[PDB]
Structure formats: C-alpha cells, structure tokens
Amino acid sequence: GADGVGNSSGNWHCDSTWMGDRVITTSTRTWALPTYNNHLYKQISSQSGASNDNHYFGYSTPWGYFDFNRFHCHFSPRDWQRLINNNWGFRPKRLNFKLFNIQVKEVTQNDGTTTIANNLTSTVQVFTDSEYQLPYVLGSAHQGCLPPFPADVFMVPQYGYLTLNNGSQAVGRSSFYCLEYFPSQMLRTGNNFTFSYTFEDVPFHSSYAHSQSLDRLMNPLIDQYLYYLSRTNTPSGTTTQSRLQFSQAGASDIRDQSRNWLPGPCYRQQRVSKTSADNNNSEYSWTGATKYHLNGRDSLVNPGPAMASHKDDEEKFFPQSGVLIFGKQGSEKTNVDIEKVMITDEEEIRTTNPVATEQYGSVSTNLQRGNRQAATADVNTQGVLPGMVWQDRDVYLQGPIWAKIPHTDGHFHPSPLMGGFGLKHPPPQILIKNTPVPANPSTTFSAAKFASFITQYSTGQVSVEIEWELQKENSKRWNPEIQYTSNYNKSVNVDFTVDTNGVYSEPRPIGTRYLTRNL
Amino acid sequence: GADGVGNSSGNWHCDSTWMGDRVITTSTRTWALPTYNNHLYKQISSQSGASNDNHYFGYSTPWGYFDFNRFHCHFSPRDWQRLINNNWGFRPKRLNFKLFNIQVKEVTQNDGTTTIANNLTSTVQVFTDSEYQLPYVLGSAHQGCLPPFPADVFMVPQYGYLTLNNGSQAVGRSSFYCLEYFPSQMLRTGNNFTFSYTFEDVPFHSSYAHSQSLDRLMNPLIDQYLYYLSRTNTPSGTTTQSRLQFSQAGASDIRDQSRNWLPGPCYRQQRVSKTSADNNNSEYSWTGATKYHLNGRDSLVNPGPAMASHKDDEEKFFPQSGVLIFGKQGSEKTNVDIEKVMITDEEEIRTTNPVATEQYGSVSTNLQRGNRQAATADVNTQGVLPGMVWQDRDVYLQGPIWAKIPHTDGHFHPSPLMGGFGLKHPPPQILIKNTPVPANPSTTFSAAKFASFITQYSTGQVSVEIEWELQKENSKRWNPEIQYTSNYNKSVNVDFTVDTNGVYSEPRPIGTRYLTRNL
Amino acid sequence: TWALPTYNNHLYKQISSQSGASNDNHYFGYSTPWGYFDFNRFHCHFSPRDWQRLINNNWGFRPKRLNFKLFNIQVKEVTQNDGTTTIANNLTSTVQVFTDSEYQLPYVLGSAHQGCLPPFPADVFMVPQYGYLTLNNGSQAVGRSSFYCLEYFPSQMLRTGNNFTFSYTFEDVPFHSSYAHSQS
Amino acid sequence: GADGVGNSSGNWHCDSTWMGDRVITTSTRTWALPTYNNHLYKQISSQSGASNDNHYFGYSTPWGYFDFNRFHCHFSPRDWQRLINNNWGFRPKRLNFKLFNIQVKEVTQNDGTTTIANNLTSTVQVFTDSEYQLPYVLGSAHQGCLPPFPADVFMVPQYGYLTLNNGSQAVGRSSFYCLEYFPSQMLRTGNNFTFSYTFEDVPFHSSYAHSQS
C-alpha cells in the first residue's frame, strides 16, 4: 500500500517487446467485483431427480477470482504472428501480477432510482494461496477470462468447488474449506497489491509440422537387405500347393518394408460430417459417444487423446467429440446451430498419430493349420507399446495455456489433453472479496447473526506480465514455407477488428503450427 | 566375535523412538535353526503326472535364511498409529541387523528318551551375498517372518530356488548354485555378527485418500467456453431430420464437460459376493479367472493392477483374485471357509482408478452413414495412454514391505503389485547353516563320503533396526478427519492382545490411508 | 468483524430487580454505555480440525501467551428522515478504547455469557454491553456498594486511521489433563 | 558384565554404619527364579459367579520382580534402636542396587528322579523401567520381600497387573503391556548388573510423641 485518496496507485505498463531470444508481454484491464451470496457460504448439490452421472456435491463461496489461462489475453493477433511464422517453439519462463487503483462504491435503492457514491473507508481483501491447499478450479476452461480486446471491462467470476458425493449426498471424506481462514491483505483506496511467480522447467511446445510421414523414412533408390514373406502358395498345377517364397522390399512395395517405429496410441471416436444430408437420422449423440466409466457413472471423453482428424482429402468429416470447438461472437448457450460454432481442424499430425475415426490396425485372431484358414480382427484401441512416437495437440489462440497435474502416485507423460503446459505447481489462484459492512444494529444486544449489510461493490485495474522463451528455426529447405496470411480481398469488415457497433470479434481459430520440420 | 562362554555377546535394545522427522524402530526375537536335508543338496521337480502349468525344476539347500519383509515385524499396533493418523507419507531410509548369543545343542536319541547337552566347540556360519548373485526368494510373500508379538519364538525357514524347466526336465541354461562356494563367517559360542544397509532413493508411499474425484475438478458456478455436440437431429415435422446442434456444458450436465485427464489403466476381474446365495452354482474358479499366458502355460494374476474394488454402496462384492486376503489366527492351509479369511477392502481409489469388475469405457466400432446406424463396444482392457493418472495399492500392516525389480532391459513404473517399495538393490539375503560334525569314522581308510553325523541344532537371538522418514501433512480442511479407532464397547477379549490361553492374534487388516488430501 | 451500537443513550443507569420477586432473585447494580470484547471460549481459537492435533496427539496443554489488536475502524452516522434511513461516513468521529489491566473493575468475564467471537470466521458479531452488580439488601443498596464510572480511566481515542494493540503474558498454571486413566 | 566362569562377579558388602548425621545400610540375600507361565502371557479375569465388587480383569506376565518395601529388610532389631530411641526423625536420602553371581541350572525329569546340571551358555535378562511406564505394583503390601534374617533364601515373585473392567469383561480403554518391548540387559554367567537412585525431597517421619494434648 501507499499514499492514497488523490494519488494513483499505479500506471499502465501494458506493452509487448521482443529481444530476439525471449518475449515479454504485458496487458491491463478494468474489472468490477460484485458481492456474491450475501456474504455467506452455501452448500450446493444437484437436483433431486437427475441421472446417476449428473450428481454433484459442493460449496459456493462469496469469494471471486482472477483467471488468465488463455493466450488471447496475452497476445494480440499481430504479436501472435512473430511467434507462429518465425519460431519452432515457445515456453512460459516467468510471470508478474498486480492490482492497483482500487475504489469502492456504495449504492442506495431509495425510491425508484438508485444513487451511487464513494465509500472511502471501505476495504477489499486479496490473497494468493501459493501452497496449493485449495481445490484448483483453473484449467477447467471456464468463462471469465480477461477480455481479448484491451478496451473492454469484465466481471470477476465467483469461486466454488466440489468434493466426494454419494448420489446427491455427501460422504464422510468430503472436505469443507473456509477461505476466511487464510491470511489475506486488506486493501483500502490508496493501497495496492503485487506478487511474482516462476515457472518450473517444461518442454517447448512444438509449432512445427513434419515434412515426412512415419510411413516413408527411407530412400526409394536402394533395396533393403531384409526379407519378408511375399507369396504363400505356388501354382504347381491346375491346383496350387503350399510353398513359401521370400522377397526383398524395394520402392515398388514400401508397404512391406521393415521399420523401427510405430504410430501413437488411439482410443477411437465416432465420425460425423459437416454436410447435414450425410449424417444418420437418430439420436446417437450420447449412445454413440466414446466414454470412460468411473465409479459406476459414465463421462464423455471430450478432447480425447491427440489424433489426426479428417484423414486425407476428406475435410467434410470430424470426430464426434474429438476436437475443440469455439463459438463465434454472441452465441447462445444451448442447442446452437452448425454455422455459429468454429470447429478446429487438426490435420498436421497425420504423419504420426492415427486418424481419430479409424482403427489402429489389424491383429491375428487364430492359429492357422491345414484345414483352418487364417483370420484377423481390427483393433480399435491401443495403449502404449515400446517404440511408438506421437505429437500433442495445438494450443491455438483462445484456448487454455496451462493445467495442473493431479497429485498422484503415478502419471504417464504429463502433457494435458486440451492443450498447453502441464505444471506440477502452476500459477497460484488469486482470490478477492468485498469486506462486509454492517448496517445500523439495534440498540439492545442480540447475539443473533447479522442479516443486514450495506450494499456495495468495488472496481479497479489489473495488470499481468509474462516472459516467454523462444526456440528459433534453422532449416535448409529450399522452397518457401506456408505462412499465416490475412486475405487481401475487400470486405465489409476487417478481420479481428471492431464492427460498426463497437463489438470486437475473432473470425476463425488460429493454430500454432505452420513452419515445417523433417521427421 | 569376542570373548565368550560366560560372557553375553549382546543386549536387547528393541525400542521405538520418534524424533519429529524420522522414525527409528528396533525389534528382537529368539530363533531355532534345524539341520535340513542331512547336510546335502537335492534337486527337486514336480510330480510325474501334473498339469502343464504346474511343472517346476529346482534345488533345495541345507541353508536357511532370515526374512523380515512384513511391517508387523517392525511396528506394534500402537506405533502404527502415529504413522497412519498423523502422516501423509513414509519411506525406509536405512536399516541395521545383527545376531548374538549363539548356542549350539547336541541331542542323543539313546533308548526311548532324548537328552540334550551343549556342544561348546561347534560352530555356525553366516553370510550375506549383497552382490545379488543368488536367486532372490524374498518378496514372494512366504511364511517364516519374525513373529508380530515379541515374546514368541520362531523357526528359521529352509532355502531353495527354481530355474528353467521343460516339462519336469531341466534345460541346458538352468543354473546350479552351491552356497558353500561363498565366503562366510564361522561363529562359535562367543562370536557375534553384524552388518548395515542403506536404501536407495524411493518415492514416498501415499497414505492420503483424495477428497475429489477425477470426475469433478471444477466449480459448478461457471459455464465452460468450449462446445460439445448436444443433439443429433431435430423434429422438423412429424418426421425428424438431421441437424447438428452444439451446447456449452454447465452444472446441469457435467458429464459432457471437457477434461485434461483420464482414469488409470485396467485389466478386468470377475466379480463375486460375500453372500453365499448370490453367487452362481458351478466351478468358475479356474475357468472364470483372469490369467496371463507365458510360454504355453497359464498363470493366474493374483493381485492384478491396482483398482478400486466394490464400487459404491455395494460392499457385498469383491473381485475374484483382485484383492489381498489374510487368514485369521490358526487357519488351515486348504479349502478354508469364508469367515476364517480376512478379505481386504480398497475403496479409497475410486476417485482415480476404475472399479475392478467393470469395463474401462466404450469405444466406437464403425463409421456411420445415412443408412448405417452407429455402434460401439465396451473395452475390457487398457494399456497406458498419455495423460492418465492412478494410485498404488495399500501396504497394510501384515503385508510385504518391499520387492526387488527384476534385472531387465526395460520396465514401466517399477512399483510392485502386492504393495510396498520396489528396489533395484533391496536388503540382501542373510543365510545361516549348522556346520557338519562327523561321527566316529572307521579305523581303515575309506574314501567314500560320510553318511553319519552328530545330530545337533542351534539357537540364539536376532535384532533388526530400521530408520524411516516421514512426510507431514499441512491442510486447511475445516472439518475433522476420519481416524483409526478401537471400539469402546465391552468385549470378552481386547483386540490385538493375547487370549486366555496365551495366543496373540490380529483381528482385522489395517490399511495405511485415512487422512485426506485434495486431488 | 464487529459492530458497536451506542447503548443507554450515552448515560449510566442503576438497575435493580423487580418489586415483587423471590428473596433470592434480588439484585442491585449499574449498566454502562460501554461495551466489551470477550473470547473466553476455545471454539474462537480452534477449528474442529486444529482441535484434533491437540486431543489425539497430546496429554496436556496450557495457555502461555496472547496478543490482541483492533484496526480498520470506521464510524457511520444514520439519518431517519422520512420513512427510510440513510447512512453515511463520519470521518471526524472517534472511538475510545482502554484495558484496565490493574483489575480495578468488577470482572464480568468467566460467567459464561453470550457474545463470543463467532466460531466460524465469516460471521459478523455484535459487541455486548457492560454492566455490574454490587451489595444489595432486598432491592435496595447498602452503604458499602460501589459505583464505578468508566469515564474516569485513561483511554485511547481512535479516529479512522488509528489502531490499537496490547499484549499479555499468562502466569504459570498446571497443564490440563487430556488423558483418561487405564486403571481404577 | 565382566570375565566369568571361574571368577566371581561380586563380593558381600552387607554392613551398617553410623556417621553421626546419616545412616548407611546394606544387606545381601540369595534368590531363586523359576520360569512362570511357560514363557507366555495370559489374560486373567475373576470367576464367572462372583460379587459385583469382586470382579477384575488383567494379565499375568512370565516376568518376575525384586521388591524391598519393608524396613526389616534394611534394619536388624538392634540397628532399629539407634534410630528409635536416639532420634526424632529420619528420611530416605539415597539408595543403590546390584545383582551378581548369576548361575543357571537345567533339570532333566528322566525316569523317576530328576538331575540338575549347569547350563553355562544360558542367559538372564533384567531391566528397570525408571520412566514409570508400567503399572506400579509396589506399595500394595504383597508378599515376597527379602527375608528379614540374612541367612534365608527367597523366591522371586511373579509380575501381573489389572486394568479397567466391566463385569468380568474388558472395556475399550484397557491397556496391554508387553514387557518384551522394553530394552533389557542380557546377563550370562560372568555378567553383573547395577543401578543407583536418588530420592526426591520428602518431609521427615515423626518418631516423637507429644507431651501435651
């Protein structure tokens, strides 16, 4: 804190710089914090009637929180292009955070019109847990981000959490956390708040696409010295007899060649098309879904393991849940049409990961003999076999930056499914509250709890700064790369700009992988 | 060794201390060592008639060995409760071992009654391999532990080993080890023996249970910004037509929400019930078992991969082999009833690992089209997919502490299946023998091998000390934890105490995980 | 977080029992405008979980030392004009606080009255009024009964930006016994 | 412990001296220790039929114990008379204790007559709790004192204890103590044992009678 009431508690830094190695990003927004719940905790549970897998049990706090998990908070559409086109990889070294210029208003509903006036003595209290002692809500891809466009004002979302349940009823192991029981900093008008954070080592995200499929690793000019079994039986006469022949695989085959590697694992998806006439007429939405079954209830697998989507020369098809889906500007919550959503497309992983809608391969069912013919079956699911390789999912732009690895005895390969950077100790949650002000107590002592409070809210500015590390590309490719370009044709509205009514919108999803590497 | 015959070679430390960080444990027992095999090695094989998977080939040595692999050796029932209730994790830093007060008796069977007298000149010889050159028998959960109750006397078990076989016949690669070909220390009455050992780094065992299921990671109060496909077709008229709608998943669904993680892998089990009337009438014991097939013979998977057992609000069911089973005091070897065994229950892993008796999930079989409806199948088995998490099995109390990782080119996540700590260099085996004494050779030279020896046995005391490291809990949970408590009601006998005949017994299994953490 | 009303309209009053009453129900005393803070109860200082390190893990405990303070004082004035009240800051108003520490007042604490700090940290509570009793005969005072004016102590007058602190040290006291005996 | 098997582990001090201020007393006895219970603990309870106030619940250990709680152990009838006639008060400042010359015999019941022979390799194990962690049996005025007359030989009594009961049945708070779970010193033939102790301040006992009512 500092001097106040007529002295600002901070300026607007809010700029982006590029040092040739690392990137430094800063952004600033204006927020408004209501009082939630009327200053009291409440338990919340699902409805009486409900599906067995829709039940939940939890609590809802008066507190509220700041979240920037999304890139578009930290990157303009132009700054995003110093990154994509020019770089193979990037990772989040370090960040910095602060709040300033806090001011608290009180409102009076007298008569039919409200009035709003400053309360200079009121306070706001803020803390960051940083010991990871609370349930961690971030990384679930909720709403309430800092707006992508710097001039908008946003509303701070409410905080809540869930724990173990049986039906709609709690179990004995379920925990209840009172946020009032942490140390926090009470901020009056002239006071300000700061903290800084340091990311743990994490591998770079890969913004390259491969220039070679795992099918073809070799030169066609030279034959292998290994043999495979080419032909099972021979035409000895008008009737064939069994004779085993062997061959060496050259450029005329290439399906029969020996290899050191296999594609990544798969957990299979249903296929649907964007053309409405192609798809079947029924509800398969839930029945045809791919699911995992945990403790007697089923849960859809929305992102799934990373897989190529539409195969080759079919754009029309995408896996049912297998992809991320973003909404356009101003889309309603429920039952919205096809042209309102923006469906992501991942074709860049064809070279390693298998297509989401097709089988991994085929495997031999039985042992052949003289009188019993061979047989085989398609394998729809694979775990990880020694000697396989894969890629991860794009981070895109408006998608999530990081997620927290659960605390467990084992985990295989931490990278999270939606995208981005798995962290064992991610950026800590920041929680904020309006301190309650009692209103006009009775003259005689009571001992009952106060039901009456002054109605008030607060507002101010918030600033975030992150340092990013870059991985440059060095490549001998002769011919030019594919780049991200805005169309040069004329239009009614420019892309990624405000319209005539002052509404900022994002036309399309933008993925991170354009530049090409060889496998 | 030291001065002897009238001077003791050691005292009894045998105590437990708690330093606030690490635990130090000591225990002392009295043992008796017979001579086995009549001082000679023998090969042993399975019976002539036998199942193809019951064959074995091996050897049986005169030597015998000390094993403490079990916690109840090192922990009383009370000492076990500063650990469980007060701590999140513990691991075995260091240990210490010694033998002392050796005395050797010789017995004469003359007439119809034996007499037993000291032999002061006889010796006992002891060694520890420590280079891991012998077959390692420990970790197979055999009998012969130090007794749990300090006042009992125990018998030292015989040592043997198995190697490659074909049928009941040996192969050419099978190895034969003569324990006489190691250096050993010959201990006479006044002599004593010691060595110490240091555990390699191993991750803490997790004595917490999770307060959140992997289903629910998020706050119900806020909607996601991601979309899923809610409804496949639309009622355009008395007949429906295909139209794709999308939706955002809030608290009213939660089965459709996007997630960054998946449950652990599964290899499925058959389900049985404790109520006798429920189960089917037949022998499915072997036929309905889950098995793995190695070199043309089948082997039951007794512990299996770690899984939750009875699901939710069904206690009555447990997986067929999927759990550990302990016997009560004085239970016979074969065909014992249901109320004699103590069946362990693992419900604490529901939040991550899937139930042992149910499928992992469902996967799409085929590609839909206009005229072909969607279809899907249940997946009964999963390997490890990137981005899954799981937990390990409880160590309990009377179960095994550690096991030795096999020496191999690769192994995934070493932790062993029964429970406890996988070690690449575990505590070395200690082997002990009675030195043979010839009896009255003939007056004329023979050159035949001696068939006649003095009949004798030895006894003494043994002491073990282990240092344990503790991991304290720091938690903001408001409401109280579940703890382990002995019932306060009156009873004929107290639990974990001797009866009226002086027989110590353990009433129930005690697992290590009570205190709760958030996922 | 607390809220302090003005009691009695800024004046002392003597109080006595009712005219008709049982001989053992009579009392004589005074009621002050002042009000007081009391935490005499454990649930103020211990959550239900923190209470379980103590019980399960320990034979005895005693209160070595304590520390106390008040901060973020703000004073509101209310206007009853018409049918609806309005409430606004008075920035120049003060609040005055003292601790006797010489044990010169009647000591009300330890009688297990209401008005503790709430057990749950998010609640707001109301500061209770202070009063005391002295010798009586029937409903009438005796000559030895004493009258204490709290205005006659030194106190600290706290305006909006001011704060208050003091600390205290317990005298030696034997541990409380949280064991039960295993032998009769 | 020390050298043994042909070397004594201690002498007989066993004397009384008077310094004009403080008294120093010493006494020595010979003991015999049987094995009790056949090397195992047993719970013990009262009989089925019994009065409500005669019920008890407890355990009986294989262990046995030394007790001198009685003056006649430490005072002859003559030494008792400097004290009484010549003094107003006395209190127990300090004590010292030891065991020595341990020898272990083994017995064979063969035929109709027993034989008894030395076992030189056998041991005896002794400890003192000193942290007061066991039930304290002493001070209940049981039998088994060191004899008053120095030439007698005595038998070491068995140890046992009681805890909470309801009827003849145990309650949940009742405790079970295994004496094997203490550190102890294992004494072979040539070994010996010692410890010393210091009394806390206690007021003198009053050996005067009043000359005024």
Side-chain angles (χ1 to χ4, degrees), chain C residues 52-73:
Chain C
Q52 197 171 359
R53 323 231 165 75
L54 178 64
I55 292 174
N56 290 339
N57 299 130
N58 293 284
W59 277 348
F61 62 93
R62 58 179 181 184
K64 300 302 285 186
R65 180 178 63 83
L66 68 81
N67 188 339
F68 177 85
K69 57 186 176 182
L70 290 172
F71 58 90
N72 287 335
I73 294 169

Coordinates of all heavy atoms in Angstrom, one line a residue, chain C residues 52-73:
Chain C
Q52 N -7.9 -31.3 16.7 CA -7.6 -32.8 16.7 C -6.1 -33.1 16.6 O -5.7 -34.2 16.7 CB -8.4 -33.4 15.5 CG -8.5 -34.9 15.5 CD -9.5 -35.3 14.4 OE1 -10.1 -34.4 13.7 NE2 -9.8 -36.5 14.3
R53 N -5.3 -32.1 16.4 CA -3.9 -32.3 16.7 C -3.7 -32.5 18.2 O -2.9 -33.3 18.7 CB -3.2 -31.1 16.2 CG -3.8 -30.7 14.9 CD -2.8 -30.5 13.8 NE -3.5 -30.4 12.6 CZ -4.2 -29.3 12.1 NH1 -4.3 -28.3 12.9 NH2 -4.8 -29.4 11.0
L54 N -4.4 -31.6 18.9 CA -4.3 -31.4 20.3 C -4.8 -32.6 21.0 O -4.0 -33.3 21.7 CB -5.2 -30.2 20.6 CG -5.3 -29.8 22.1 CD1 -4.0 -29.4 22.6 CD2 -6.4 -28.7 22.2
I55 N -6.1 -33.0 20.8 CA -6.7 -34.1 21.5 C -6.0 -35.4 21.3 O -5.5 -36.0 22.2 CB -8.2 -34.3 21.1 CG1 -9.0 -33.1 21.6 CG2 -8.7 -35.5 21.7 CD1 -10.4 -33.2 21.1
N56 N -6.0 -35.9 20.1 CA -5.5 -37.2 19.8 C -4.0 -37.4 20.1 O -3.5 -38.4 20.4 CB -5.8 -37.6 18.3 CG -7.2 -37.8 18.1 OD1 -8.0 -38.0 19.0 ND2 -7.6 -37.8 16.8
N57 N -3.2 -36.3 19.9 CA -1.8 -36.4 19.9 C -1.1 -35.9 21.2 O 0.1 -35.9 21.3 CB -1.2 -35.6 18.7 CG -1.7 -36.2 17.4 OD1 -2.2 -35.5 16.5 ND2 -1.6 -37.5 17.2
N58 N -1.9 -35.5 22.2 CA -1.3 -34.8 23.3 C -1.9 -35.1 24.6 O -3.1 -35.3 24.7 CB -1.3 -33.3 23.1 CG -0.4 -32.8 22.0 OD1 0.8 -32.8 22.1 ND2 -1.0 -32.5 20.8
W59 N -1.1 -35.2 25.7 CA -1.5 -35.4 27.1 C -2.0 -34.1 27.7 O -2.9 -34.1 28.6 CB -0.5 -36.1 27.9 CG -0.5 -37.6 27.8 CD1 -1.5 -38.3 27.2 CD2 0.5 -38.5 28.2 NE1 -1.2 -39.6 27.2 CE2 0.0 -39.8 27.9 CE3 1.7 -38.4 28.8 CZ2 0.7 -40.9 28.1 CZ3 2.4 -39.5 29.1 CH2 1.9 -40.8 28.8
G60 N -1.4 -33.0 27.4 CA -1.8 -31.7 28.1 C -1.4 -30.5 27.3 O -0.5 -30.5 26.5
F61 N -2.0 -29.4 27.7 CA -1.8 -28.1 27.0 C -2.1 -27.0 28.0 O -3.0 -27.1 28.8 CB -2.6 -28.0 25.7 CG -4.1 -28.0 26.0 CD1 -4.8 -26.9 26.1 CD2 -4.8 -29.2 26.0 CE1 -6.2 -26.9 26.3 CE2 -6.1 -29.2 26.2 CZ -6.8 -28.1 26.4
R62 N -1.4 -25.9 27.8 CA -1.7 -24.7 28.7 C -1.4 -23.4 27.9 O -0.6 -23.4 26.9 CB -0.9 -24.7 30.0 CG 0.6 -24.8 29.7 CD 1.3 -24.8 31.1 NE 2.8 -24.8 30.9 CZ 3.6 -24.9 31.9 NH1 3.2 -24.9 33.1 NH2 4.9 -24.9 31.6
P63 N -2.1 -22.3 28.3 CA -2.0 -21.1 27.5 C -0.8 -20.2 27.9 O -1.0 -19.4 28.8 CB -3.3 -20.4 27.9 CG -3.7 -20.9 29.2 CD -3.2 -22.3 29.2
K64 N 0.3 -20.3 27.2 CA 1.5 -19.5 27.6 C 1.2 -18.0 27.4 O 1.4 -17.2 28.4 CB 2.7 -19.8 26.7 CG 3.1 -21.3 26.8 CD 3.5 -21.6 28.2 CE 4.8 -21.0 28.6 NZ 5.2 -21.4 30.0
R65 N 0.8 -17.5 26.2 CA 0.9 -16.1 25.9 C -0.1 -15.7 24.9 O -0.5 -16.5 24.1 CB 2.3 -15.8 25.5 CG 2.6 -14.4 25.1 CD 4.0 -14.3 24.7 NE 4.3 -15.1 23.5 CZ 4.1 -14.7 22.3 NH1 3.6 -13.5 22.0 NH2 4.4 -15.5 21.2
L66 N -0.6 -14.4 24.9 CA -1.6 -14.0 23.9 C -1.2 -12.6 23.4 O -0.4 -11.9 24.0 CB -3.0 -13.9 24.4 CG -3.5 -13.0 25.5 CD1 -3.9 -11.7 25.0 CD2 -4.8 -13.6 26.1
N67 N -1.9 -12.2 22.4 CA -1.7 -10.9 21.7 C -3.0 -10.5 21.1 O -3.8 -11.3 20.6 CB -0.6 -11.0 20.6 CG -0.2 -9.7 20.0 OD1 -1.0 -8.7 20.1 ND2 1.0 -9.7 19.5
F68 N -3.3 -9.1 21.1 CA -4.6 -8.6 20.7 C -4.5 -7.3 20.0 O -3.6 -6.5 20.3 CB -5.4 -8.4 22.0 CG -6.8 -7.7 21.8 CD1 -7.9 -8.5 21.4 CD2 -6.9 -6.4 21.9 CE1 -9.1 -7.9 21.2 CE2 -8.2 -5.8 21.7 CZ -9.2 -6.6 21.3
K69 N -5.3 -7.0 19.0 CA -5.4 -5.7 18.4 C -6.7 -5.4 17.6 O -7.4 -6.4 17.3 CB -4.2 -5.5 17.5 CG -4.0 -6.6 16.4 CD -2.7 -6.3 15.7 CE -2.3 -7.3 14.6 NZ -1.0 -7.0 14.1
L70 N -6.9 -4.1 17.4 CA -8.1 -3.6 16.7 C -7.6 -2.7 15.6 O -6.6 -1.9 15.7 CB -9.0 -2.8 17.5 CG -9.9 -3.4 18.6 CD1 -10.6 -2.3 19.3 CD2 -11.0 -4.2 17.9
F71 N -8.2 -2.7 14.4 CA -7.8 -2.0 13.2 C -9.0 -1.8 12.3 O -10.0 -2.4 12.4 CB -6.6 -2.7 12.6 CG -6.9 -4.1 12.1 CD1 -7.4 -4.4 10.9 CD2 -6.7 -5.2 13.0 CE1 -7.7 -5.6 10.5 CE2 -7.0 -6.4 12.6 CZ -7.5 -6.7 11.4
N72 N -8.7 -0.9 11.3 CA -9.7 -0.5 10.3 C -11.0 -0.1 10.9 O -12.1 -0.6 10.6 CB -9.9 -1.7 9.4 CG -8.8 -1.9 8.4 OD1 -8.0 -1.0 8.2 ND2 -8.6 -3.1 8.0
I73 N -11.0 0.9 11.8 CA -12.1 1.5 12.4 C -12.8 2.4 11.5 O -12.2 3.3 10.8 CB -11.7 2.2 13.7 CG1 -11.2 1.1 14.7 CG2 -12.9 3.0 14.3 CD1 -10.5 1.7 15.9

